[PDB]
Design a protein around this ligand. Structure first.
Ligand code: NA
Ligand code: NA
Ligand code: NA
Ligand code: NA
Ligand code: NA
Ligand code: NA
Lengths: 173, 173, 173, 173, 173, 173
């Protein structure tokens, strides 16, 4: 019943990897919802739409890399429903960037809890996998979203529709 | 409240497009689950894994094209949870191909019901969108999966593990 | 007497690196013996021979990288005899792949014990050297050998000589 | 007052990163002083001058990478005076290489103390940043300077001015 | 004790060159502090950060050219501590440009005092070195910073965060 | 039990080929030990290290060519332990070259005894294999090592560390 490849891979780590797969698929779905909000004819910011669609595809790659890790270590993937995002209408480019920053901090907190579990189960391959492929990516994503929120607030968003239009052209274009 | 672009787009068509978006995202998730089943070390058929991962990414493109249509016609996308697939373990390459054929026939039946609704609401742009981008794609997908099931059964799958290995190398490779 | 470069490098870590050098040279020698078994005229599977000769040369590179680490940290290499492999005749391609999987799991267990010693002696350079250059290589090697054993058993090896011939041509060729 | 990006970044780690920035800027300044000592007309070893000027520019890049890390994690850089180096006249190429080895061991000891603090504050992103970008660089720098000191002493430096001239041409040229 | 190359190089000129080396290293350090202020997530003007980091590296080249001059004329470099800059937080892009203009005028006044000393000691090689490599560079730097301050004030900085964002994109980008 | 390919291949020749395989693997291991001695920070002669590592890899190719010969003639390879080299510390570049000359003369004496056995068992294919692939290689290796020992002794090694440094740069570089 145990996989012939499994070695030093605790059942609690296997279950935490399955929960992280679901959270990465959920973040992919939130960014897909934000992307198509900015494609609506009454919002119409195409480079915001492009930026969040690229983030949706990168979160799906993060989930597929954890599914490959679960099979490489001999664990078994167990998928759950992907809940729908908490908003349908994201209000403004600034509000969506602030929601993305909040989501990325939540994903980063889950990865730090997974690292702590891997360290407590003395699984250095899993600790290094999370440090190499996920933790610096999340620090860079959080710093980029914080810079975007700071620039939109300083330019006068959300009240200034000129600010979001020019940020869409000069920063996200 | 009505979109400034909306013309000849009935609320029942808008709701049926939202249900089809969810079904395409669900099919993407079923094929992602099949792909990583064939990547397990106790199944180990890499070209089956590749074939179903490519199908998962194509179903996500089908869902994003319907989200773009909903915004082009001035409807509003409403997302729902993506339910987890009906199986975790798909048994054999033949059983997964038969499950994919069943899923693609279900998706095709939903598209034929959407076409019938668009014809009854006299929406020729939506009828042509479904004929141009979805109905022939589904007939081709169903005929390719039927050919794969026929070849695997004739070669002696699922009992012959030699049959699935050589089908993985010569048809899916 | 202490090297002028030595810093934060405990004598127990130096001795464990010398034991790991010997185990990597021993694994190189086991794979060289398997390679030339499959080159015999009464076994004659050339791509099995090639696959194990490539593994023998990669294990010698693993040993030379640990010898370079021992000199970079100011430890002193102490070599021991390389024992001959436990078998002369490896029986079949499936039996040799299962023996290789067993050997790679043993090498991985020794590397996990070396990581635990480096963590207990607070030597983060040595922990990171082992995570960066050895632990993911071993997880990938073990998953590839597990996939090869699974495919050979499903195709009907070792009893089916047709199975090993076609695996040699289509997977290892 | 807390940065919007800050997560899992303890104030003691932030202060230790500010001290390491100052030590890397101080090492850049020591190597700049050594470089221009070997450019004097009464010392005149141009490849020693080039080697230490390249080391000065690499230590400034090490300091700027830690300043970028401090902003990526939401800490605040606080700069201090850069003290002048302990020598004006470095005596001979061998004495300067021995002083560089001593300086690089001091920088490495400070990085090992920073790693230990990051491990005690459970900050795996900072532990991995220090292992990935600093600890192996320092082990390589210390082993290269130890090899240079060994070769200059064996060739008869500092008493043999022929030894330093030929080392400048054949090893540093 | 006198260098074999020294000719027509007065001890007061040698000491003034050592003070100018320290001032160029201090200006390099002020611009490095400004650069990383604009890289903070709550300021986030990347092209201001790039512009001041380039100025920091050019001031270090100005210091190294004066160290090369001191050795070419047979004087002896004597380094002093590099004091930390007068600010940690530079407030806004306009305030940092005004501080840079003030710093460059101070550096230019020191170079004009060095030229006057070289003229009073009848050292035409040193007068021409300062005119050729430093005085026109400083007039160009001061005119460029004055143009930047004028444009930022006319666009409405520092109160208009839109002004600094668009200046960062169109003038410094 | 006799191989279907075996013809004119006496059991005493088969056993002598197995002993020569072990001696070539032992010489590979002695040269690997010499290579990493010259990589130590207190010896630090990189081109001596490179020269002996290349010799280690060439002796492993000599052993693998005799394993291929044993299978081509239908004999059975029987491997034995590879004993560790007689020294851990090789003293100086001259002493290691003299030890290599002694080792290569021993390998050549074993090959001349194998040729004499093949001639006494009237096995001209094996005599020609040894003349074509091994005897002139050994005469060239012994003459090159004798030239290296002569040059190092004439330059004043081992007492002159300048001699070994310049031989490492001009002859082995
Ligand atoms: Na992610
Ligand atoms: Na579809
Ligand atoms: Na290995
Ligand atoms: Na450094
Ligand atoms: Na300057
Ligand atoms: Na040989």
């Amino acid at each position: 019943s145990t996989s012939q490849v499994r070695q030093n891979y605790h059942q609690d780590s296997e279950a935490a990897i399955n929960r992280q797969i679901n959270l990465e698929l959920y973040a992919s779905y939130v960014y897909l919802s934000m992307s198509y909000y900015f494609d609506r004819d009454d919002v119409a910011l195409k480079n915001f739409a492009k930026y969040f669609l690229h983030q949706s595809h990168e979160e799906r790659e993060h989930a597929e890399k954890l599914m490959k890790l679960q099979n490489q270590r001999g664990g078994r993937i167990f998928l759950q429903d992907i809940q729908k995002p908490d908003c349908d209408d994201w209000e403004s480019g600034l509000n969506a960037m602030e929601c993305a920053l909040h989501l990325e901090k939540n994903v980063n907190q889950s990865l730090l809890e997974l690292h702590k579990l891997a360290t407590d189960k003395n699984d250095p391959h899993l600790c290094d996998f999370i440090e190499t492929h996920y933790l610096n990516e999340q620090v860079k994503a959080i710093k980029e979203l914080g810079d975007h929120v700071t620039n939109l607030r300083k330019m006068g968003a959300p009240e200034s529709g000129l600010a979001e239009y020019l940020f869409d052209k000069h920063t996200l274009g």
